[PDB]
């Protein structure tokens, strides 16, 4: 139709083309105009002219006030970090330096600094720069812990709520408990003055912390506390965060009936207020995919992560930790989905993208590698088995062994010898040594995984079930131990049918191994009845291939707030 451009957008291009001779006067423009000049600078590819003005804290504070065009600001910021300029660290250091000077100043200037710090730290935490958002929030806390007045406790407990989110995401779990204790101390100080702050956000962040350290027993209790603390006046972001963390804590204790309601309500709230193209909606999508992957709904989980990643590649840009987490989550889901098919082409591409981003933006001794690496170390294993060559198989298995050793070392340094993540790494190493034909080492690693996981989780937990399934596969197919394999296969089958019913996908990988076992030892009646059982399992599996997309399965207004919360609370009795 060829509509002529708006005089606003025509003068913006004329202002940008005259940028150098009118750079000082642009800073004296309305915030909506001033952001559009910088967005036009990014659009024209003039990042160095744009990056030299986003480095100043006060100039970046005005473009942070454009809450409407924040999806463009995140993309500009991610372009600047990929450009080479370290604006995230420069802005954090500038805020801390200009913050230490007005510690003794009046209440209005400190209030302005606190507000600027909240908006900047929220931006840097949303963008994924947790090591840089921590310094901003630390300086905000340092302002808050100066005058022991009324509003300062509220602002300090808000600072400590925001410090957990930038420490859980930065894998500083040792400082997370200290931050929660400090926040709880300030809440007690508030309670001594007859005023109770809303503790839903803090308890949700602590639930994230305890789920990250694999403390699911405590994580479930603290998410129960957070959901009890949810009120009607909570912001949408806070209740969404609490709901999705409570879903992640409920699905890991295998309360799938409650986790589905919590995460579907979280996804619905995220899609209503934020939209289908928002970072928080993408976070809810990642947690929904985590739910779907844990409940043997893997085909829908891949599509959910694919929807989650596509939001993060649009809102953010290239080398970002949020895009990296979306990649490493989608790589694992595509791995588990295409495990039987063997088409590890997209899974390897997504796992390689995750490591190619985390290594660039995080130190080599960081915990977030231990996820991405191990995901690749799974796929590289299954490509090694599928490859008919022996040289390529040996090279891939050696690379996967190096990646698994690195991830296990990171998990041991972070959590300890007796964590569930360390047990997962030991189980993966046992599978790899089974693939590497080191059968004694595989047996030792699987026994170590069983011993670590049995005490931490339940005796009949799902993780213990899959790990005894791996050990039974090792004993049956490789070590020819025909009785320990039988008992472990029976344990895995019993737990799978107890938890997921007859539709559990690991049931076929247990039945085929057990049929091979019985063919090796005899008792053809057992073989016949387990062929019948496998046929029935295949029937139920093809019947449950509805695979309706879970994006619209959350529907439009199935229930409301403080109804899913209330149902989850009453169901605890």
């Amino acid at each position: 139709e060829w509509i002529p451009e708006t005089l606003y957008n025509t003068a913006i291009s004329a202002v940008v083309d005259n940028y150098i001779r009118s750079r000082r006067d642009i800073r004296s423009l309305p915030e909506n105009i001033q952001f559009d000049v910088y967005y036009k600078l990014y659009q024209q590819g003039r990042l160095c002219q744009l990056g030299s003005e986003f480095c100043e804290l006060e100039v970046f504070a005005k473009v942070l006030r454009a809450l409407d065009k924040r999806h463009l600001l995140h993309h500009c910021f991610q372009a600047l970090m990929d450009h080479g300029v370290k604006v995230a660290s420069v802005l954090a250091y500038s805020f801390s330096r200009r913050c230490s000077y007005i510690a003794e100043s009046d209440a209005a200037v400190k209030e302005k600094a606190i507000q600027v710090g909240f908006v900047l730290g929220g931006f840097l935490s949303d963008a994924g720069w947790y090591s840089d958002a921590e310094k901003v929030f630390l300086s905000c806390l340092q302002l808050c812990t100066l005058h022991d007045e009324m509003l300062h406790w509220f602002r300090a407990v808000e600072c400590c709520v925001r410090l957990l989110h930038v420490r859980n995401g930065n894998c500083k779990y040792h400082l997370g408990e200290e931050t929660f204790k400090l926040a709880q101390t300030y809440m007690d100080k508030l309670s001594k003055h007859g005023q109770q702050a809303n503790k839903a956000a803090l308890y949700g962040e602590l639930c994230a912390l305890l789920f990250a350290k694999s403390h699911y027993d405590e994580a479930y209790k603290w998410c129960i506390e957070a959901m009890k603390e949810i009120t009607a006046g909570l912001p949408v972001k806070v209740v969404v965060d609490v709901l999705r963390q409570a879903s992640k804590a409920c699905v890991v204790k295998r309360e799938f009936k409650k986790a589905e309601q919590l995460i579907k309500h979280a996804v619905y709230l995220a899609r209503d207020h934020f939209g289908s193209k928002h970072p928080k909606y993408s976070d809810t999508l990642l947690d929904y995919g985590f739910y779907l992957l844990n409940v043997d709904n893997i085909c829908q989980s891949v599509a959910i992560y694919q929807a989650a990643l596509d939001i993060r590649q649009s809102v953010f840009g290239g080398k970002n930790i949020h895009v990296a987490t979306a990649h490493e989550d989608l790589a694992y889901s595509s791995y588990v989905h295409q495990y039987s098919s063997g088409k590890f082409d997209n899974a390897l591409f997504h796992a390689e993208r995750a490591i190619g981003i985390i290594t660039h933006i995080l130190p080599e001794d960081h915990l977030l590698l231990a996820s991405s690496k191990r995901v690749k170390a799974l796929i590289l294993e299954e490509i090694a088995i599928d490859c008919h060559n022996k040289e390529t198989e040996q090279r891939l298995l050696q690379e996967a062994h190096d990646l698994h050793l690195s991830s296990l070392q990171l998990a041991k340094k972070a959590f300890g010898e007796f964590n569930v993540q360390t047990a997962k790494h030991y189980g993966n190493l046992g599978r790899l040594y089974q693939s590497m034909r080191k059968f004694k080492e595989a047996e030792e690693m699987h026994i170590k995984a069983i011993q670590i996981k049995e005490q931490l989780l339940g005796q009949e937990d799902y993780e213990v079930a899959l790990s005894v399934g791996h050990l039974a596969s090792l004993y049956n197919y490789d070590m020819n131990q025909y009785e320990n394999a039988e008992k472990l296969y029976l344990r895995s089958i019993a737990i799978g049918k107890k938890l997921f019913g007859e539709g559990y996908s690991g049931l076929e990988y247990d039945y085929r191994g057990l049929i091979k076992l019985y063919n090796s030892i005899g008792n053809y009646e057992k073989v016949f009845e387990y062929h019948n059982v496998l046929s029935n399992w295949n029937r139920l599996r093809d019947r449950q291939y509805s695979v309706t997309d879970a994006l619209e399965d959350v529907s439009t207004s199935p229930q409301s707030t403080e109804e899913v919360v209330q149902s989850f609370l009453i169901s605890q009795n």
């Binding site: 039987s340 799974l378 993966n428 399934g469 596969s473 197919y477 247990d510």
Partner: peptide
């Protein structure tokens, strides 16, 4: 295949 998917 022999064993289940890697956890």
């Amino acid at each position: 295949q022999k064993r289940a998917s890697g956890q």
